[PDB]
Amino acid sequence: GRHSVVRVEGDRAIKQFFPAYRYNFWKEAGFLSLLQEFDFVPRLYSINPEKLEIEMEFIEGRPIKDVINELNSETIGRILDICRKLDVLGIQKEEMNHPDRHIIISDRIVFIDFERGVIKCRPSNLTQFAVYLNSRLRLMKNEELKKLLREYKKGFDDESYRELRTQILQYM
Amino acid sequence: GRHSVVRVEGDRAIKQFFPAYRYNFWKEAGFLSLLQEFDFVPRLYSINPEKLEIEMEFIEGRPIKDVINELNSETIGRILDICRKLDVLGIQKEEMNHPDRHIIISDRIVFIDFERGVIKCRPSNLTQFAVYLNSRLRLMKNEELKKLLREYKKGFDDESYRELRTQILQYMK
Numbered sequence: 065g066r067h068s069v070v071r072v073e074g075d076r077a078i079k080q081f082f083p084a085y086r087y088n089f090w091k092e093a094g095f096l097s098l099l100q101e102f103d104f105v106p107r108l109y110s111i112n113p114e115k116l117e118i119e120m121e122f123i124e125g126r127p128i129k130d131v132i133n134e135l136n137s138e139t140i141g142r143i144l145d146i147c148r149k150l151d152v153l154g155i156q157k158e159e160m161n162h163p164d165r166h167i168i169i170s171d172r173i174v175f176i177d178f179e180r181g182v183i184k185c186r187p188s189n190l191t192q193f194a195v196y197l198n199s200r201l202r203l204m205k206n207e208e209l210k211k212l213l214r215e216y217k218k219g220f221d222d223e224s225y226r227e228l229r230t231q232i233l234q235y236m
Numbered sequence: 237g238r239h240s241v242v243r244v245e246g247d248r249a250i251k252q253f254f255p256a257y258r259y260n261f262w263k264e265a266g267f268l269s270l271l272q273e274f275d276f277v278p279r280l281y282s283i284n285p286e287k288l289e290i291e292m293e294f295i296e297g298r299p300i301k302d303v304i305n306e307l308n309s310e311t312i313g314r315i316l317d318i319c320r321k322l323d324v325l326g327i328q329k330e331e332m333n334h335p336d337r338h339i340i341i342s343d344r345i346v347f348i349d350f351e352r353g354v355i356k357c358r359p360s361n362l363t364q365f366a367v368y369l370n371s372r373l374r375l376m377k378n379e380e381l382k383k384l385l386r387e388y389k390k391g392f393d394d395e396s397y398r399e400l401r402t403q404i405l406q407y408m409k
C-alpha cells in the first residue's frame with residue numbers, strides 16, 4: 065500500500081504523492097524541513113504542491129535490511145542516537161519497527177520517509193527500532209527487552225537513554 | 237532587527253531570509269508545511285533553499301495591532317481557539333505575547349511568521365497570547381492572570397482550556 069512513486073533524475077530523488085495523499089505530502093515536506101539542521105536526512109531542494117512532488121537529495125548507500133547482520137556496535141549506536149534525537153525533538157516517525165528500506169547506510173547514516181510522522185510528547189522511535197533490532201539480531205528475550213524499554217519510557221531522559229544504549233550494545 | 241525581507245508579487249508574499257538565518261528559513265518552511273491541513277496559515281507554494289526564499293499566499297486583512305481594542309469577544313475567542321489548536325498540535329510558535337504584526341484579520345483569521353517555532357509537549361501559545369491580551373485590554377491584575385495560566389498548564393486538556401477561555405473572555409468590556 066504505497067502513497068507515492070519515487071523516481072530519480074540526476075542526483076535527485078523525486079517523490080510524487082498520489083492525489084489522495086496530499087495529507088502525507090505536507091508531513092513529508094514539513095518534517096524534512098524541520099530536520100535540515102541535522103545530517104541524518106536528505107537535503108530538501110523543492111516542493112511542488114500542485115504536482116505533490118518533493119525533490120530531495122538521492123542518498124547513496126545500502127538499506128538497513130541488506131546489511132543489518134554486518135553492522136558493528138559502532139554503527140548501531142549511531143542509529144540508536146538518531147532515534148533518541150527524534151524522541152527528544154518530539155517527532156514520532158512511525159514504522160520504526162520496520163525501518164527495512166528507510167535507513168540508508170554508507171560512510172554516513174541517513175533516514176528517509178517522514179510522510180507518516182506525527183508530533184508526540186514521548187515518541188516511540190527508539191522503542192520501535194529496538195523491537196526491529198531484537199527481531200533481526202535476536203539480542204535478548206522479549207521480556208528482557210520490555211523491561212529495558214519500560215525503564216527508558218518511564219524516565220525518558222539522557223540518563224535513561226545512556227543506560228538503555230549501553231545495555232543494547234552489550235548484547236552484541 | 238528582522239530576519240528577512242518580505243516582498244509581494246501578484247497574490248504571493250515572498251519572504252527572503254538573510255543568509256545568517258538559514259536556520260529560521262527551514263523552521264518557517266517546516267511549520268507552514270505541517271499546518272497546511274488547517275485554514276489559519278498561508279498556503280505554501282514553493283521553497284528555494286539557494287535563495288532562502290519562501291513563496292506563500294498573501295493574506296489580505298488588518299494586523300491585530302491595528303484593531304485589538306475594537307475586537308469583539310467572539311473574535312477574541314476564535315483567536316484563543318487557534319492558539320489552543322497549536323498547543324494541542326505541539327507547536328510553540330513563540331512571540332505570541334507580541335503578535336502585533338502576525339495575526340491578520342478579515343472575515344477569517346490567519347497567523348503568519350513561524351520561523352521561530354519549536355516543538356514542545358505543552359506549548360505556550362495561549363499563555364503568551366493571554367499576556368498580550370491583558371496588556372492591551374487591561375482585563376485583570378497580573379497576579380490573577382498568572383494563577384489562571386498555571387492552572388491551564390497543569391491540566392492542559394479540553395476542559396481546562398475551556399475554563400481558561402471563559403475566564404479570559406468574561407473580563408472583556
Ligand SMILES: Nc1ncnc2c1ncn2[C@@H]1O[C@H](COP(=O)(O)OP(=O)(O)OP(=O)(O)O)[C@@H](O)[C@H]1O
Nearest residue numbers: 065066067068070077106120121122123165176177
Ligand atoms: N532520498 C532518497 N535517496 C535514495 N533513495 C530514496 C530516497 N527517497 C526514496 N528513495 C527510494 O525510494 C523508495 C520509496 O520511497 P519511500 O520509502 O519514501 O516511499 P514508499 O515507502 O515506497 O511509499 P509510501 O511510504 O508513500 O507508501 C525507498 O524505499 C528508497 O529505495
Ligand SMILES: Nc1ncnc2c1ncn2[C@@H]1O[C@H](COP(=O)(O)OP(=O)(O)OP(=O)(O)O)[C@@H](O)[C@H]1O
Nearest residue numbers: 237238239240242249278292293294295337348349
Ligand atoms: N503571508 C503574508 N501575507 C501578508 N502579509 C505578510 C505575509 N507574510 C509576511 N507579511 C508581511 O510582511 C511583514 C514581515 O514578515 P514577517 O513578520 O513574517 O517577517 P520579519 O519581518 O522577518 O519578522 P521577524 O523578524 O519578527 O520574524 C509582516 O509583518 C506582514 O506585514
Ligand SMILES: [Cl-]
Nearest residue numbers: 308309310409
Ligand atoms: Cl461582545
